[PDB]
From a paper:
PAKs are serine/threonine protein kinases that are regulated by Rho GTPases of the Cdc42 and Rac families (Knaus et al., 1995; Manser et al., 1994; Martin et al., 1995). In humans, the PAK family comprises six members, which are classified into groups I (PAK1, -2, and -3) and II (PAK4, -5, and -6) based on their domain architecture and regulatory properties (Bokoch, 2003; Jaffer and Chernoff, 2002; Kumar et al., 2006; Zhao and Manser, 2005). Group II PAKs (PAK4–6) regulate a wide variety of cellular functions, and PAK deregulation has been linked to tumor development. Comparison of five high-resolution crystal structures comprising the kinase domains of all three monophosphorylated, enzymatically active group II PAK family members revealed a number of catalytically productive and nonproductive conformers presumably representing snapshots of catalytic domain movements during catalysis.
Finally, we solved the structure of noncatalytically productive apo structures of PAK4, PAK5, and PAK6. In the apo structure of PAK4, large regions of the kinase domain were disordered, including parts of helix αC, the glycine-rich loop, as well as part of the activation segment. Evidently, the activation segments remain quite flexible in that crystal form despite the presence of the activating phosphorylation site at residue Ser474. The significant disorder of PAK4 in this crystal form precluded detailed structural comparisons with other PAK family members.
Author numbering: 300 to 328, 334 to 353, 362 to 465, 468 to 587
Write the structure that this text describes.
């Protein structure tokens, strides 16, 4: 915190306020929810009073798979963010108790990939890809959340120590320069999550795990006993230790595993329980 580091802040932010059109607020828990007098839509804000990276970077972007960040303001020492609110939860409330299928799995994967595919050419990297950063509509539509760790990359390589260890890239843990390909390794660990329910080494304290991520072969499935050879095949391309022999998002859409993705509706009954 500092009011000079908040100097390059205010500028990149709309002025005025939201409660000129928006009004019927209510603390819900996240913070608030208002209404649009023009239509009646409600929004959910997250108030406050680096992190630089969400505001500037993603204020220039919008995808149907990314919770839309509408507008940004502050009164005094307090930032107001209008945001696309959804009721439908995170994939973590699902993976942890029941066992998904390839149709549901395939749908979370390509959904996640539809985002990455444009976020990446656009020169940005999530850096915290895991089930926990995925949100769902009540209807069963799939989106990518939580860009509290992102950054904009001449400068095509990066090396900042960030994310969540059990999902991290070896090149990233190993302090070898990486690119967006890290986001690609993370998907596979989220895949292990969808099949077995947990990320590898999750029994371990994070740091030693980061060693075991560091110097063991790519992680293998404990299930497999109910695993179509196609999920292996897809899985088998994303868990590459050599960053360069690792498959690309552009490649993965063309993958036959993805013939099995289901509609939103096909996903709905997982949250229903």
């Amino acid at each position: 915190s500092h009011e000079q580091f908040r100097a390059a802040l205010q500028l990149v932010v709309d002025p005025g306020d939201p409660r000129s059109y928006l009004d019927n607020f209510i603390k819900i828990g996240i913070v608030c929810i208002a209404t649009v007098r023009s239509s009646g839509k409600l929004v959910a804000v997250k108030k406050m009073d680096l992190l630089f990276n969400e505001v500037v970077i993603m204020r220039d972007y919008q995808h149907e798979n990314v919770v839309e960040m509408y507008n940004s303001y502050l009164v005094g020492d307090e930032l107001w963010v209008v945001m696309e609110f959804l009721e439908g939860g995170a994939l973590t409330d699902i993976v942890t108790h029941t066992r998904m299928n390839e149709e549901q799995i395939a749908a979370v994967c390509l959904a996640v990939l539809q985002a990455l595919s444009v976020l990446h050419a656009q020169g940005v990297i999530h850096r915290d890809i895991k089930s926990d950063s995925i949100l769902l509509t009540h209807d069963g539509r799939v989106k990518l959340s939580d860009f509290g760790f992102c950054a904009q990359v001449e400068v095509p390589r990066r090396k900042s120590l960030v994310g969540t260890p059990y999902w991290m890239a070896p090149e990233l843990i190993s302090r070898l320069p990486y690119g967006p390909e890290v986001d690609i390794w993370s998907l596979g660990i989220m895949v292990i999550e969808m099949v077995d329910g947990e990320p590898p080494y999750f029994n371990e304290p994070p740091l030693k795990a980061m060693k075991m991520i560091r110097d063991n072969l790519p992680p293998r499935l404990k299930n497999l006993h109910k695993v179509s050879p196609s999920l292996k095949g897809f899985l088998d391309r994303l868990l590459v230790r050599d960053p360069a022999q690792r498959a690309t998002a552009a490649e993965l859409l063309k993958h036959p595993f993805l013939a099995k993705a289901g509609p939103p509706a096909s996903i709905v009954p997982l949250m229903r329980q």
